[PDB]
Amino acid sequence: SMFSSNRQKILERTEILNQEWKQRRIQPV
Amino acid sequence: CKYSFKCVNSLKEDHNQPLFGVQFNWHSKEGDPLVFATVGSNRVTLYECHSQGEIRLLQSYVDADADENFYTCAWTYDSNTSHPLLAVAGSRGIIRIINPITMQCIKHYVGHGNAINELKFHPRDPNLLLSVSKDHALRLWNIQTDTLVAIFGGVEGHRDEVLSADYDLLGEKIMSCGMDHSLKLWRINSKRMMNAIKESYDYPFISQKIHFPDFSTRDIHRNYVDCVRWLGDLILSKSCENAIVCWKPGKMEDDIDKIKPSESNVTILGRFDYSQCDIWYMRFSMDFWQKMLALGNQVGKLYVWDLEVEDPHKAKCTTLTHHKCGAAIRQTSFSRDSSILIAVCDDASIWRWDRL
Ligand SMILES: COc1ccccc1CN1C[C@H](c2cn(C)c3ccccc23)[C@@H](N(C)C)C1
Structure with a gap:
């Protein structure tokens, strides 16, 4: 389906963003 | 929908x-305190979320x-010092970069x-800032070199105020929308744009003047x-x-990049219907994983949908209401882990909803 395909795109792409955030150590505010 | 929330606290700003x-x-590392900013009047305020609904x-x-009168805010970090x-x-049309640790203008x-x-900040490059304006244009800034990369408008640009814009997940393209009833696509992974961004880092800087979008439609909404x-x-x-419309440029099978x-x-794929949000300038938001969609209405109600449920009518969550929250919810924000949802109102009130 269009839904499941789009869901996997979101999943794959948010995982890429999540991995980039994990390597980061942004100092606390 | 599986999601439930409890209203644990509220406050009102003195202005x-x-x-x-x-x-x-969302840049704060895992374990660090959940911090949010609010904007309204000539004020920017920072709060920290603690246990038992404490808003510090x-x-x-x-x-x-x-x-x-501040209408918007967005977070980023210094690509060199990891400073938020x-x-x-x-x-006033002025972009201010504020050190949130000192609360002073940088x-x-x-x-x-x-x-x-x-x-809006680019999701990959923390220096790329997008501003949308009443002058009918979008502007892309490189805040590391203090250059205006590109101006998106002109011949085929918006014909009235640009009200909102968003980068896609990988930061390859932007969708803008506004008072002229149109939604316009602007590709930033084009050779021209990718080179203009590269040049902004090598830098009087000559901004790109993008007169033509990569898609334009005025057949989704009638206002x-x-x-x-x-x-x-x-x-x-x-x-x-009274609906959020889920759609795609072109026919059912047409690839976004083709x-x-x-x-x-x-092509419309669905609609997320609600009630009493018939007044202009009401923002919707999603959590980081795009599993939840939230929108406030003019009467203090907070609607939530589970984006993992295909049928939007079946996706509906129990609407979040508190007898003391009666004013228009202008915007909402989920914490990075979606355990906390904050709503802000026309009466300067702030509402904290915690995941159950
Ligand atoms: C909540 O803001 C949203 C939400 C969605 C899109 C854009 C905006 C930003 N707006 C700020 C302006 C505004 C000024 N005053 C006094 C207002 C009172 C109430 C509501 C909005 C305004 C608006 N213009 C076009 C008139 C657009």
Whole structure:
């Protein structure tokens, strides 16, 4: 389906963003 | 939908003026405190979320100009020092980069003509800031070199105020929307744009003047399009017609990266219906994983949908209501882990909803 395909795109792409955030150590505010 | 929330706290800012924006800082590392910013009048305020619904006031920014009215804010970080940063803008058309640790202005950018309605940071490059304005244009800034990379408008640009814009997940393209009823696509992974961005880092800087979008439609809504966000290769957009519309440029099977600038087709996949949100300038938001969609209405109700349930009517969550929350919810923000949801109102009130 269009839904499941789009869901996997979101999943794959948010995982890429999540991995980039994990390597980061942004100092606390 | 499986999601449930409990209202654990609320407060009201002493200025009593409407709050237009709220954003949790999604750059803060795991374990660090959940911090959000609010914007309204000439104020920017930072709060920290603690246990048992505690909302701890951190610092208040009060703009020298009493006539300034902030409409939006967005978070970023310094690519070199890992220092958090906060961009704000409003009616004066001035972008202010604020050190959220000291609550002092680092730098500002005039550039834009008229009111700035929304700010957004690129999801990959923390220096690329997008401002959308009352002057009908979008502007891309490189805040590391203090250059205006590109101006998106002109011959085939918006014909009225740009109200909202969003970068897709990988930061390859932007969807803008506004008072002219249209939604316009602007590709930033084009050779021209990728080179203009590269040049902004090598830098009087010559900004790109992008007169032509990569897609344009005015057949989704019959009024002002006041909010827009990507959902994968699909779009989420709303007007004042009591629905958020899920659609895609072109025909059902058309790949987002294969649609041509003159593409006349548009495909609606669904609608997330609600009630009493028939007034202009009401923003919707999603959590980081795009599993939840939230929208406040003019009467203090907070609607939530489970984006993992295909049928939007079946996706509906129990609507969040508190007998003391009766004012228009202008914007909402989920914490990075979606355990906390904050709503801000026209009566300067702030509402904290914790995941059950
Ligand atoms: C909550 O803000 C949203 C939400 C969605 C899209 C854009 C905005 C930003 N707006 C700020 C402006 C505004 C000024 N005043 C006094 C207002 C009172 C109430 C509501 C909005 C405004 C608006 N212009 C076009 C008139 C656009």
